[PDB]
């Protein structure tokens, strides 16, 4: 909540090409063939975005974090592994929201196989199944790791790159689910309800924004949590 | 609570090695006659499953109609594909004057007197979609002044 001057590395955008003209309002200028985000409008939108986040958090709402850019995977896997908001990390399966019932059936199979490997029924029905179901539970935990926490449809979603995760954005629009997103120059701002005009490539921007967001979430529900152990993931 | 009536039921066919294989498509309108309508198009290997699926899709796609004394507030003209729909309000005592598709759609919406005309393509699917978009493009004087507040 004090990220005014500590925003080191967020103003960096993508190149001159691969941009979206609809983002021109959130751009300050172009330095050395690279779009640089407007520093003022960044916090201008951050006010309203974080205010919506606090309102939805203190009401007890669930937010789905979505990240697949391979630069925010290890960060989302723990910033959402804090206060119990679910997440999707490896890839966004088509129909996680519109076909939410079938994916919940997949989650049922996940916890069923978890109950099988907890019961003494592991050894019966010989080793063929002990390998098949082992690999099946492996991949189910690989994909539905954070998604298993959703019992109903989420009240909002959080996206790291709305261009790379455009399918989740589209499904959220279809179901009238608010779309919080960390938008860059390559993204369409109209599809994002609450926009965060920052960098989606640099690890520091993602760590800063997501850490402060989860800190605001836990601050809305009381019991301020220690700083997130995602700094060591700078590497 | 919800009234349901099918527009048309057709049997389409694909070609497979050995012969043609059929698939049934059905249009279904659902309405409470209070100002809410819904249009759905379901496809299933059998007819009853297609009718039920079209009913589900019709309940999923709803349109709020701003009725004013059982008629429409202002004349509309909608081009869906090559099909054109022309809606025009009428005084009470007239009745719903329309083709089968728009008559069913507007009657299930709660309309009692209106003057319509289908133009261009008479295709029941495109005419149904044109009538749905027409009802979706309806505005009231309240909505008009709401837009022009400034």
């Amino acid at each position: 909540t004090v990220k005014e001057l500590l925003e080191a590395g967020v103003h960096f955008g993508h190149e001159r090409k691969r941009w979206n003209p609809k983002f021109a309002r959130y751009i300050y200028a172009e330095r050395n063939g690279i779009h640089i985000i407007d520093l003022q409008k960044t916090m201008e939108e951050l006010e309203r975005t974080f205010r919506f986040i606090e309102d939805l958090a203190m009401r007890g709402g669930t937010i789905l974090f979505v990240g697949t850019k391979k630069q925010a995977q290890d960060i989302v896997r723990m910033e959402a592994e804090r206060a119990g908001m679910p997440y999707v990390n490896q890839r966004w399966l088509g129909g996680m929201l519109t076909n939410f019932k079938t994916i919940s059936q997949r989650v049922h199979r996940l916890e069923e196989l978890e109950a099988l490997f907890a019961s003494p029924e592991i050894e019966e029905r010989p080793k063929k199944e002990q390998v098949r179901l082992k690999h099946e539970l492996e991949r189910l935990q690989k994909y539905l790791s954070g998604f298993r926490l959703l019992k109903r449809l989420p009240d909002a979603i959080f996206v790291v790159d709305p261009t790379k995760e455009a399918i989740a954005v589209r499904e959220a629009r279809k179901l009238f689910i608010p779309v919080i997103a960390l938008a860059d120059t390559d993204s369409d701002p109209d599809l994002v309800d609450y926009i965060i005009p920052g960098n989606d490539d640099a690890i520091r921007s993602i760590q800063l924004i997501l850490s402060r967001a989860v800190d605001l979430i836990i601050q809305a529900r009381g019991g301020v949590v220690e700083p997130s152990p995602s700094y060591a993931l700078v590497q | 609570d919800f009234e349901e009536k099918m527009i048309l039921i057709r049997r389409t066919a694909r070609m497979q090695a050995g012969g043609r294989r059929f698939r049934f498509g059905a249009l279904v309108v659902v309405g409470d006659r209070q100002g809410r309508v819904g249009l759905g198009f379901g496809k299933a290997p059998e007819v009853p499953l297609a009718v039920q699926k079209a009913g589900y899709y019709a309940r999923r796609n709803m349109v709020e109609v701003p009725l004013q004394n059982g008629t429409i507030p202002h004349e509309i003209e909608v081009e869906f594909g090559a099909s054109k729909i022309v809606l025009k309000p009428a005084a009470p005592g007239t009745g719903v004057i329309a083709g089968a598709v728009p008559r069913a759609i507007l009657e299930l919406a709660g309309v009692t007197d209106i003057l319509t005309k289908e133009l261009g393509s008479r295709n029941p699917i495109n005419i149904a979609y044109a009538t749905m978009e027409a009802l979706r493009q309806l505005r009231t004087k309240a909505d008009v002044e709401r837009l022009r507040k400034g």
């Binding site: - | 009470p92 005592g93 007239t94 009745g95 719903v96 004057i97 089968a100 008559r103 009692t112």
Partner: protein, 208 residues
């Protein structure tokens, strides 16, 4: 022509109990009480989902066969109502109810509308004093429909007006039983009629 022939077959075909014989459509002998299916060899067979034209045509045929009016006069009355200002359906119903034979039936002078037609056609009915023998005569608000003084000694009128003791008449009608007369107070509203017919379906039928 007046369709003259079997009547309760229409009670069956129309699917709704009609009253074309007066009595015996109230007694368990209407053949609609015991045979509600349409007539013919294929009456008991499973009916197919009728078309919209089927629904509108059957509704209009119900409304027409209720009064026993030919298609010519029926279409003429409908066009006449559509020319007038006001709701086409309610004005049409008020016109049909204004027919002299239907007024005779409503005032209890005859048990059925066809018996009322025979009573009018044979000069047993007077309007404001003058004898009128036209079932298609239109009654105006304020006209006194009376029984012919020379006919008040007939057996049928004695029976009919002997059964009308204690019975009530429509809100738009008054009845003097001792003098064997009545008055047409006003045109009846749609709420006043208990007809099992949707008039908008008939309007849509003639909209084609």
């Amino acid at each position: 022509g007046r369709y003259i022939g079997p009547v309760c077959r229409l009670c069956r075909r129309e699917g709704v109990k009609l009253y074309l014989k007066g009595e015996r459509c109230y007694s368990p002998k209407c053949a609609m009480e015991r045979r509600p299916y349409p007539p013919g060899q294929h009456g008991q067979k499973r009916a197919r989902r009728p078309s919209d034209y089927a629904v509108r045509l059957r509704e209009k045929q119900k409304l027409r066969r209720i009064y026993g009016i030919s298609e010519r006069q029926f279409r003429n009355l409908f066009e006449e109502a559509s020319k007038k200002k006001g709701v086409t359906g309610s004005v049409f119903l008020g016109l049909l109810e204004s027919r002299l034979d239907n007024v005779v039936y409503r005032l209890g002078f005859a048990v059925s509308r066809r018996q009322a037609r025979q009573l009018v056609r044979h000069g047993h009915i007077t309007v404001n004093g003058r004898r009128v023998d036209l079932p298609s005569y239109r009654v105006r608000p304020g006209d006194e429909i009376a029984v012919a003084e020379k006919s008040r000694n007939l057996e049928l009128i004695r029976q009919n007006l002997e059964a009308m003791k204690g019975r009530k008449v429509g809100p738009w009608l008054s009845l003097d039983v001792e003098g064997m007369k009545g008055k047409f107070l006003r045109l009846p509203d749609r709420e006043d009629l208990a007809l099992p017919v949707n008039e908008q379906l008939v309007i849509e039928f003639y909209s084609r």
